Design a protein around this ligand. Structure first.
Ligand SMILES: *P(=O)(O)OCC(C)(C)[C@@H](O)C(=O)NCCC(=O)NCCS[C@@H](CS(=O)(=O)NC[C@H]1O[C@@H](n2cnc3c(N)ncnc32)[C@H](O)[C@@H]1O)[C@@H](N)CS
Ligand SMILES: Cc1cc2nc3c(=O)[nH]c(=O)nc-3n(C[C@H](O)[C@H](O)[C@H](O)COP(=O)(O)O)c2cc1C
Ligand SMILES: Cc1cc2nc3c(=O)[nH]c(=O)nc-3n(C[C@H](O)[C@H](O)[C@H](O)COP(=O)(O)O)c2cc1C
Lengths: 329, 458, 329
């Protein structure tokens, strides 16, 4: 009945004269005597109570303060890590040959980009095969663009919204089938949608879980809502205009029992497969989409009532494309 | 309107899947609240709790408190709310003075394994003439006996005059030891609306975020809460979810409707107040825009099933106005004070030409425009840093002083709760957007300065 | 001029009575005195020579043996980790409620799959919106299947092969554009192809780097070749029949200077975007594709002469679909 916490794989450590270095912070007080044994103990999975019995030796108020902070600072966690924590140690392994001003200066970035778009692999030989551009590509692939401004008046028709979301549904035909691929055919991505008021015909505002087996939306949360402060500054106008928000969620229980940790990796790939699949059906239906890399997923995860085995990988904003005005409603 | 818990049961059958009450991460639907209040009501009856009894409940900001309250009413008994932050000696006084049998806290449904009791309907116990709750005021404190018939009349007319329905969402700011909360709990439920509970009522910044995050539509507080909250609000803020503002308690400042109209341009703000000694409310007067500005805001007309009088020394109506004492009558009147006959005989009297009346003690006059105006009631060293000086200056303007020691407790100048928020509000406005609470937990002037400045905006 | 090695983020540790536990192995000998300070030293990046000067104190042959083994066992690494090492610590965080026999028994798996395909999110409310299947989906999306057997006689026409690979090329139009999305428009996935002899008209066997700016293949390696023992048993017949192999490679230098570690995550998503985009152009051209989750990427990475900042994320086998026989050539 007690919660079991594990040491986060994303956190690396060191002992110090100052105190216990964990991540980018130095800690002081009781935690100095508990350590380093506490590190060893914590990878195995331990409760708050067991930790207190083993380390308290004194004020249980003094012991609870350090335990409360290690959980808050995400050194002790209750379930699978979100992607951003998974990849965080990689910064210490990548040697950056450019200046930081690429991120702070539009002029430094515009140059870094043009250099990366004309890059080649260094181990290339002096032979070439010029192919042929003569081919024709489907317009749904070649004309897809990221839409960051939407028609905020015309509601998405119930037929249009149903068609877009039918790209993700099941198909019974001697065996369950989707319209997109999935490592091992396990399809461990839960699909959620947030709909804004009056922006999708037939769908009241709120968070819904899309059940691909029924082809139905099932309400999760109509009380809370997504706001602009949940989004990065550069994306707040994208969200403001959009009719709905898609959230791609990895269900570890639908994957990891078979493929282990690689199933989490496969679901990140599958998220892109879903994203790209979506953006084509959208172009067929004159719906625009734009992928969102980061946003306050800690809040969205809470709104959707996700369990310990679910983490949000990706978000997409969507809506009808501009072409004509309408009566303001 | 029968009883309070019967209005909830009838509506819970209409919209069983509608959210009944929300706190933070777990909330109860109308069917869930009905099932768990039935289970606890049966548990109370197993302890001999029935008609004529009184049950103490702790007004913690948790959804379990809503279950206990509804379960006490379903058992036929009245509930007496107890503030968990009150000292033990004051909590004990009310519990013994009210002759309560037991005290219900949040440790009950899981502690007593009440999930095993029956969750079905219970054949009714309470009648509209029965007592629904006894609430103590003026802490020494005196309890007010409100019946089910009385509490339902106030609630039924608010919801029907303002068309409260399923789409509404009420923010639960007022503590349950104050009679205002009864509308936030029972008035919300009788219309199929959702109640959002607030963890800390003096966290003005959280109150603002809660209104925007959860689409709050109804605001029901003392006007002091709205005026203090809008002083933690930027000049470019605007919200369109709030559609009804019910203000009552203490005076109603003139600059406040200007703030309410500019930040909530769609909110119908209503100036009211009805004395706890009656059903909570008794007067109804919408801000009817503003075509009139002088020095005071008028009270209004009786809400419904209630009457108002400006009486002289022989209990006769003062002509064409005439400032005098204020009396009320009608279906909202309380039964009396609990176990105090002297105060009951003086306050609740019989009118020579009309039904029973209650003496509010307030003074006022009937304007020729038909509304009654409220005319009052009772007749008879040096700082060590630039940041410390700025913080002292705010303490100086709010508490009206000159120079203070940094170790002078914030209330050495008489500082209270309302002035504590006023201090941090002015600190918030000038660019110290941090902890606007923590004014009594940290006596040192500097300790507050280290807590309010830095970081701030972003 | 010396190589700098870092402690692998994928490796967690503990001290022991037996010796130094690193990963799933216990180590003995000199390494016991060097530790734990060696751990602290190694996260910062250290050479073999500097390590010897600091820890040798004795036989430089005895010091080199332990250093050689920590590099071999991937405790000390020279560059970014491949995806499989990135995600490996996640196994200790996922509590598996099923039995291991799902992986060993076709009957246990067939049941686990059907349970995961009829799963729902647990926090669902009792409201439903039945949508509409009445829509029509493009055949290129709805008819795509994973093709694991190919026409091994008819060569892929040079026009067909050029068209498929034109989905990944650049388009100059006031600004460089692709036919697929990329976080920040940085497009950090290098695309490589291995072509089997005689299976693609116009393309000699060998490893090529596809340059999207020229729309050209540039040879990297014609000496080595991919063989069936480089593939998992369950995939060897897929590879045997296929005409070519696609390899999706993350170029950290084209991404991480801007987005940090999240750019590695974004490239995994982008790999799926590319994979899915490819599998549709293929269906338009009656080419079949099948994604490959794992394979001996350590060898392929070596054949392609990848640098420290490049790791292989994904592989795809491709070829013409069966429909008619031909003369055996
Ligand atoms: P700190 O931690 O202590 O800070 C928090 C505090 C407690 C300061 C603050 O958060 C707080 O007050 N919180 C409690 C919530 C709240 O609103 N409590 C007030 C009780 S509501 C109840 C009061 S009453 O009207 O019955 N009082 C009766 C009496 O008041 C006079 N009166 C009220 N409104 C009037 C108007 N508009 N005009 C003239 N007089 C008014 C009358 O004399 C009346 O008889 C209300 N809601 C029920 S009526
Ligand atoms: C993972 C991901 C996240 C993105 N996030 C944003 C974003 O936050 N804001 C934005 O304006 N575009 C965003 N984009 C859009 C692309 O970075 C880029 O602008 C564009 O999609 C490249 O091709 P396109 O312009 O044809 O769409 C994102 C794309 C991806 C793949
Ligand atoms: C990342 C990934 C790896 C896959 N690896 C294999 C594989 O090794 N062998 C195989 O036969 N199918 C493999 N597949 C195919 C799918 O797991 C699955 O069989 C099929 O694609 C599901 O839809 P479909 O049958 O319509 O293609 C892989 C798919 C993905 C997405």
């Amino acid at each position: 009945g007690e919660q079991i916490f594990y040491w986060s794989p994303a956190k690396h450590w060191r002992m110090s004269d100052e105190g216990v270095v964990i991540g980018e912070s130095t800690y002081t007080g009781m935690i100095l005597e508990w350590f380093p044994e506490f590190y060893f103990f914590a990878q195995t999975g331990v409760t708050i109570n067991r930790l207190l019995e083993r380390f308290s030796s004194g004020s249980e108020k003094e012991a609870n303060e350090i335990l409360e902070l290690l959980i808050q600072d995400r050194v002790l966690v209750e379930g699978i890590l979100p992607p951003r924590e998974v990849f965080s140690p990689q910064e210490g392994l990548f040697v950056n040959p450019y200046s930081e001003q690429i991120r702070y200066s539009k002029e430094a970035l515009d140059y870094y980009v043009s250099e990366q778009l004309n890059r080649t692999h260094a181990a290339c030989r002096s032979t070439k095969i010029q192919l042929e551009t003569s081919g024709a590509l489907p317009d749904i692939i070649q004309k897809r663009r990221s839409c960051r401004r939407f028609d905020m008046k015309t509601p998405v028709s119930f037929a249009t919204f149903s068609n877009l979301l039918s790209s993700l549904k099941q198909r019974k035909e001697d065996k369950i089938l989707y319209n997109y691929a999935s490592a091992g055919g396990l399809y461990p991505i839960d699909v959620f949608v947030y709909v804004k008021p009056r922006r999708v015909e037939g769908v009241k505002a709120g968070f819904y879980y899309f059940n691909p087996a029924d082809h139905s939306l099932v309400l999760v949360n109509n009380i809370d809502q997504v706001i602009k402060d949940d989004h990065e500054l550069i994306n707040q106008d994208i969200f403001a205009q959009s009719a709905f928000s898609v959230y791609l969620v990895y269900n570890a229980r639908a994957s990891m029992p078979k493929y282990g940790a690689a199933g989490y990796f496969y679901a990140c790939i599958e998220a892109g497969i879903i994203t790209a699949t979506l953006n084509m059906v959208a172009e067929d239906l004159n719906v625009g989409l734009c992928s969102i890399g980061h946003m306050n997923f800690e809040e969205i995860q809470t709104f959707l009532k996700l369990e310990d085995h679910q983490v949000i990988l990706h978000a997409i904003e969507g809506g009808l494309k501009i072409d004509g005005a309408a009566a303001e409603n | 309107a029968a009883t309070l818990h019967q209005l909830f049961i009838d509506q819970a059958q209409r919209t069983p899947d509608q959210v009944a009450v929300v706190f933070e991460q777990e909330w109860l639907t109308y069917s869930e609240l009905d099932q768990r209040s039935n289970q606890v009501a049966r548990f109370l009856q197993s302890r001999g709790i029935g008609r004529g009894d009184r049950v103490g409940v702790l007004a913690k900001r948790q959804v379990e408190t809503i279950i206990n309250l509804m379960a006490v009413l379903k058992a036929g008994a009245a509930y007496v709310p107890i503030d968990p932050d009150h000292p033990y000696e004051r909590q004990t006084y009310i519990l013994e003075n009210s002759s309560c049998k037991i005290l219900l806290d949040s440790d009950l449904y899981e502690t007593m394994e009440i999930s095993s009791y029956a969750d079905g309907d219970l054949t009714p116990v309470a009648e509209p003439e029965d007592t629904a709750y006894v609430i103590y005021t003026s802490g020494r404190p005196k309890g007010v006996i409100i019946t089910h018939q009385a509490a339902s009349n106030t609630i039924q007319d608010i919801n029907r005059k303002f068309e409260v329905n399923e789409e509404d969402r009420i923010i639960g700011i007022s503590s349950m030891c104050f009679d205002l909360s009864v509308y936030d709990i029972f008035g919300t439920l009788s219309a199929g609306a959702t109640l959002v509970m607030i963890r800390d009522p003096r966290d003005m910044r959280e109150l603002v975020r809660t209104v925007e995050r959860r689409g709050i539509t109804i605001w029901n507080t003392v006007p002091a809460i709205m005026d203090l909250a809008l002083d933690h609000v930027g000049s470019h803020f605007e919200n369109i979810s709030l559609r009804l503002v019910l203000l009552s308690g203490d005076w109603i400042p003139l600059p406040l409707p200007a703030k309410i109209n500019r930040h909530f341009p769609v909110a119908d703000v209503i100036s009211l107040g009805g004395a706890t000694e009656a059903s909570i409310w008794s007067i109804y007067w919408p801000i009817e825009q503003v075509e009139a500005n002088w020095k005071s805001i008028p009270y209004g007309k009786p809400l419904a099933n209630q009457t108002y009088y400006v009486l002289n020394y022989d209990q006769k109506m003062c002509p064409v106005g005439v400032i005098g004492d204020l009396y009320i009558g009608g279906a909202g009147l309380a039964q009396g004070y609990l176990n105090d006959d002297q105060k009951t005989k003086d306050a609740f009297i019989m009118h020579p030409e009309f039904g029973p009346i209650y003496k509010t003690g307030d003074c006022g006059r009937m304007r020729p425009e038909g509304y009654i105006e409220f005319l009052g009631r009772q007749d008879y060293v040096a700082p060590q840093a630039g940041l410390e000086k700025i913080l002292a200056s705010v303490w100086q303007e709010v508490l009206n002083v000159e120079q203070i020691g940094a170790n002078d407790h914030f209330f050495a100048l008489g500082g209270d709760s309302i002035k504590a928020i006023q201090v941090s509000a002015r600190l918030f406005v000038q660019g110290y957007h941090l902890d606007t609470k923590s004014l009594f937990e940290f006596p040192v002037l500097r300790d507050v300065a280290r807590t309010i400045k830095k970081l701030a905006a972003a």
